[PDB]
From Swiss-Prot:
Changing residue 828 to Q: In CRC; uncertain significance. Changing residue 375 to K: In MCAP, KERSEB, CRC, BC and HFMH; somatic mutation; shows an increase in lipid kinase activity; oncogenic in vivo; occurs in the interface between the PI3K helical domain and the nSH2 (N-terminal SH2) region of the p85 regulatory subunit and may reduce the inhibitory effect of p85; requires interaction with RAS to induce cellular transformation; enhances invadopodia-mediated extracellular matrix degradation and invasion in breast cancer cells; increased AKT and RPS6 phosphorylation in HFMH patient's cells. It comes from the Eukaryota. This is Phosphatidylinositol 4,5-bisphosphate 3-kinase catalytic subunit alpha isoform. The keyword Transferase applies. Residues 601-607 are annotated as: G-loop. Residues 195-339 form the C2 PI3K-type domain. Residues 81-166 form the PI3K-RBD domain. It comes from Homo sapiens. GO terms for cellular component: cytoplasm; cytosol; intercalated disc; lamellipodium; perinuclear region of cytoplasm; phosphatidylinositol 3-kinase complex; phosphatidylinositol 3-kinase complex, class IA; phosphatidylinositol 3-kinase complex, class IB. GO terms for biological process: actin cytoskeleton organization; adipose tissue development; angiogenesis; anoikis; autosome genomic imprinting; cardiac muscle cell contraction; cardiac muscle contraction; cell migration. The PI3K-ABD domain and the PI3K-RBD domain interact with the PI3K/PI4K kinase domain. The C2 PI3K-type domain may facilitate the recruitment to the plasma membrane. The inhibitory interactions with PIK3R1 are mediated by the PI3K-ABD domain and the C2 PI3K-type domain with the iSH2 (inter-SH2) region of PIK3R1, and the C2 PI3K-type domain, the PI3K helical domain, and the PI3K/PI4K kinase domain with the nSH2 (N-terminal SH2) region of PIK3R1.
Length: 855
């Protein structure tokens, strides 16, 4: 009717292509995916609408809290006998008069326990605490130290500004929104293990094979990246008539193919491959493909080594002009189905010590997921299946020991997975990579993922959990139903879940899968769809604004380029879309009225856009009066977000161990095709600008801005904020540390800025470390700059598996740095976990003393 036709237009605006364009898809899987089996996401809507409007407040404004309630030991010493001073504001007045209160509370006070003391001070479930200057609310019962804002105040010794609002005022801001089902929501066999035959797949011809010496098709059965059998060749034929009509015979027995087994295609010319394509041998209904099939082949491999592409996308190229290879897979005069779990469980049951072996299990468990496991070690893990259960973290290595060529082994391993003890979520994430493709294995991780991930940990790893959706071979699966439910229960999760999918829409390998996912999110996200629509039109206004600035690239600032930006932002169509919404880079920051005098274009080779937005809050001055965000268009920001996510994980590990590393990872998001946003850090200047364009001017600026008892802190933190970025630069192999890539805050805290590429491709810093000494090396303060570095990598080395699992997931992301696992070998190269950290230290000095010529 009218409302359904109305709703379907902004949904197509928020995703970029119409909803009706999904109705013309002929694929039964796509239409079946959109049907009511996936619209059970109404359970998310029913959950968030259950205890309205409190549940709608929790959904719209989810708490930004910490994973661990317990405060670090060194941070607990920053308090005053377990007390934190907070300023409580109660504003009841005609227009703008504000009342200020100061409280003496514990650091772990309940958010509604602050009200009791604040009201008691005023009067020597009615109010809520909002952070002054942003839309952050203390709605959930969590310790104040657990909340990110108050803990960050203890991080830097800042003053926590919290103000009082009546809960009825926030509730009135959340009108009820209901979920309505769409039009398309209305609406024996033969086992695979009973047919005694070998796998036999016919190659007929290539419709539009890319050729301009002979052409042959290279095929192989794969389960992840390992070969499920010997690859089978095809007779070479002339390029003019690539007609093959050959029934290739595979050494793999038909009642031996695993559920996730798939056939990989490769048209090769003599031996350079021409095109690649993977075909799932089964379907989402557990049906082995039969009859004639047509597949359009993807473009020339993936810049990889071997001919086939075992890991990738299982499907036909959306472009119909791509080389199309038609195949006649099977003909058994019946419908052949992969057996149910009950048959498999009985099949496995039918078939069925304190030596160094128990100590060898621990050694294999602690090894990193790139140390190749030898066959004798793989056979070693085979015979200790009943003992590998005692060590839950051996499961990733056990799943590579089992051979998927054998029906009895895979059936035996299935019974292990169901009774396998739950593991840590960080380890369970590796089970969702390109390897480990078995649906029971792939679904085991999700069950532990949904039980042990917190909302903030999910927020840190959300960029990783999205990228592993592509490693799933079907549109409907256990992982997406976990991710979709999370996005429709938390606005903060849903905000970044939406923007991460939408950023990956220009990629036709995932546009079909992500487009269906976005539609299921946009249909049930509630009133946030119009907020998201405002952000989408605000960003797409800037995307065309930056693109039209790229037309006049050869121009200077304070000129045609600068005057075009000034005049084009005063236009009511431009200006209305560019205010009164929530910042894409932070859902709690309202990008209100613009400041045309405070928005400019940087005079750099990229020319990004400095954009300044007022803070429309009655108490905006208590945090910040303006939002500064860098909108740049032309360079990919996916590498930047990954590196900045490593920094956050790196500093969190160091902080929890009593190492007061105080590095600052600035906000970063990717919103489209190499388009993104950067959270500006104010009160910070590039070193290249500090030295106006001598090797002592850097220390002078820090000295005159910190005079008296505060001079030590500008030096105490400068050493700690420079040590953390030298280790992080070398561990991650980040590029040249240009003077323009580094900025230092007013109070000595410095950080690195141009990140991106990594793992490959008399200093004014030192005089500051020695507190202005001419020879820093001989000074005592230099030993603190080195002893703290030495105590640091042990935290990274003890937690190197996390930095490996999180890197194994971006292979299917299109980022050139992480094409293969060989690019993650740099992590174990610069950390050396196979060695001992008694001897891994010596490798670190030999690298710092070679580039810096001693020290
Ligand atoms: C996180 C961050 N904070 C900044 N702060 C200021 O620029 N400030 C802070 C106040 C004065 C002003 C200045 N020019 O001194 S810049 C910045 C940043 C982050 C990432 N890339 C960049 C650039 C400039 C290299 C790029 F590529 F975007 F153009 C900048």
């Amino acid at each position: 009717n009218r409302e359904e036709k109305i709703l379907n237009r902004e949904i197509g605006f928020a995703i970029g292509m119409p909803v009706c364009e999904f109705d013309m898809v002929k694929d039964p899987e796509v239409q079946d995916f959109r049907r009511n089996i996936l619209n059970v996401c109404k359970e998310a809507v029913d959950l968030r609408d259950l205890n309205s409007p409190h549940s709608r407040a929790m959904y719209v404004y989810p708490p930004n809290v910490e994973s661990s309630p317990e405060l670090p030991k060194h941070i607990y010493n920053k308090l005053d006998k377990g007390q934190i001073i907070v300023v409580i504001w109660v504003i009841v007045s005609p227009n703008n008069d504000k009342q200020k209160y100061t409280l003496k509370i514990n650091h772990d006070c309940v958010p509604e326990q602050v009200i009791a003391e604040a009201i008691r001070k005023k009067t020597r479930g009615k109010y809520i605490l909002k952070v002054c200057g942003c839309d952050e609310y203390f709605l959930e019962k969590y310790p104040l130290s657990q909340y990110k804002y108050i803990r960050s105040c203890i991080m830097l010794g800042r003053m926590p500004n919290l103000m009082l609002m009546a809960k009825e005022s926030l509730y009135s801001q959340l009108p009820m929104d209901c979920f309505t089902m769409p039009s398309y929501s209305r609406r024996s066999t033969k086992s695979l293990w009973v047919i005694n035959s070998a796998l036999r797949i016919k190659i007929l011809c290539a419709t539009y094979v890319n050729v301009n010496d002979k052409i042959y098709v290279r095929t192989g059965i794969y389960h992840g990246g390992e070969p499920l059998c010997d690859n089978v060749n095809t007779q070479r034929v002339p390029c003019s008539n690539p007609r093959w009509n050959e029934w290739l015979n595979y050494d793999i027995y038909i009642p031996d193919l695993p559920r996730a087994a798939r056939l990989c295609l490769s048209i090769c010319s003599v031996h350079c491959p021409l095109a690649w394509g993977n075909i799932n041998l089964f379907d989402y209904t557990d049906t082995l493909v039969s009859g004639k099939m047509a597949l359009n082949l993807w473009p020339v491999p993936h810049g990889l080594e071997d001919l086939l592409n075992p890991i990738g996308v299982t499907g036909s190229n959306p472009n119909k002009e791509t080389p199309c290879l038609e195949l006649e897979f099977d003909w058994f005069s019946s419908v052949v189905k992969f057996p149910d779990m009950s048959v498999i469980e009985e099949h496995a049951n039918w078939s069925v010590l304190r030596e160094n072996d128990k100590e060898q299990l621990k050694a294999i468990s602690t090894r990193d997921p790139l140390s190749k496991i030898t066959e004798q070690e793989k056979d070693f893990l085979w015979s200790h299946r009943h003992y590998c259960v005692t060590i839950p973290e051996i499961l990733p290595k056990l799943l590579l020991s089992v051979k998927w060529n054998s029906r009895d082994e895979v059936a035996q391993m299935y019974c292990l997975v169901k009774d396998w003890p739950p593991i840590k979520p960080e380890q369970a994430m590796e089970l969702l990579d390109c390897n480990y493709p078995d649906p029971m294995v792939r679904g085991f991780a999700v069950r532990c993922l949904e039980k042990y991930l917190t909302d903030d940990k999910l927020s840190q790893y959300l960029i990783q959990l999205v990228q592993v959706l592509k490693y799933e071979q079907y549109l409907d699966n256990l992982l997406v139903r976990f991710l979709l439910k999370k996005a429709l229960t938390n606005q903060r999760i849903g905000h970044f879940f939406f923007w991460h999918l939408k950023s990956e829409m220009h990629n036709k390998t995932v546009s079909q899968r992500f487009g269906l996912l976005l539609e299921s999110y946009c249909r049930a996200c509630g009133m946030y769809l119009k907020h998201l629509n405002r952000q989408v039109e605000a960003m797409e206004k800037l995307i065309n604004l930056t693109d039209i600035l790229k037309q006049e690239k050869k121009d200077e600032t304070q000129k045609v380029q600068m005057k075009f930006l000034v005049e084009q932002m005063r236009r009511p169509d431009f200006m209305d879309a560019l205010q009164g919404f929530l910042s894409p880079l932070n859902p709690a920051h309202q990008l209100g009225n613009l400041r045309l005098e405070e928005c400019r274009i940087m005079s750099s080779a990229k020319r990004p856009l400095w954009l300044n937005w007022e803070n429309p809050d009655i108490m905006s001055e208590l945090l910040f009066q303006n939002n500064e965000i860098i909108f740049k268009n032309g360079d990919d920001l996916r590498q930047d977000m990954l590196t900045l996510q490593i920094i956050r994980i790196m500093e969190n590990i160091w902080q929890n161990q009593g190492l007061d590393l105080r590095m600052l990872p600035y906000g970063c998001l990717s919103i489209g095709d190499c388009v993104g946003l950067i959270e500006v850090v104010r009160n910070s200047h590039t070193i290249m600008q500090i030295q106006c364009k001598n090797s002592h001017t850097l220390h002078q600026w820090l000295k005159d801005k910190n005079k008296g008892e505060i001079y030590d802190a500008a030096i105490d933190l400068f050493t700690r904020s420079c040590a953390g970025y030298c280790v992080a630069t070398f561990i991650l192999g980040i590029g040249d540390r240009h003077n323009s890539n580094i900025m230092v805050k007013d109070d000595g805290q410095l950080f690195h800025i141009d990140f991106g590429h990594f793992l490959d491709h008399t200093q004014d810093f030192l005089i500051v470390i020695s507190k202005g000494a001419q020879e820093c090396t001989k000074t005592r303060e230099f030993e603190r700059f080195q002893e703290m570095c030495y105590k640091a990598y042990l935290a990274i080395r003890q937690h190197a598996n996390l930095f490996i699992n999180l890197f194994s997931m971006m292979l299917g992301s299109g980022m050139p740095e992480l094409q293969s696992f060989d690019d993650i070998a740099y992590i174990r190269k610069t950390l050396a976990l196979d060695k001992t950290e008694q001897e891994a230290l010596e490798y670190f000095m030999k690298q710092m003393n070679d580039a810096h010529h001693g020290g």
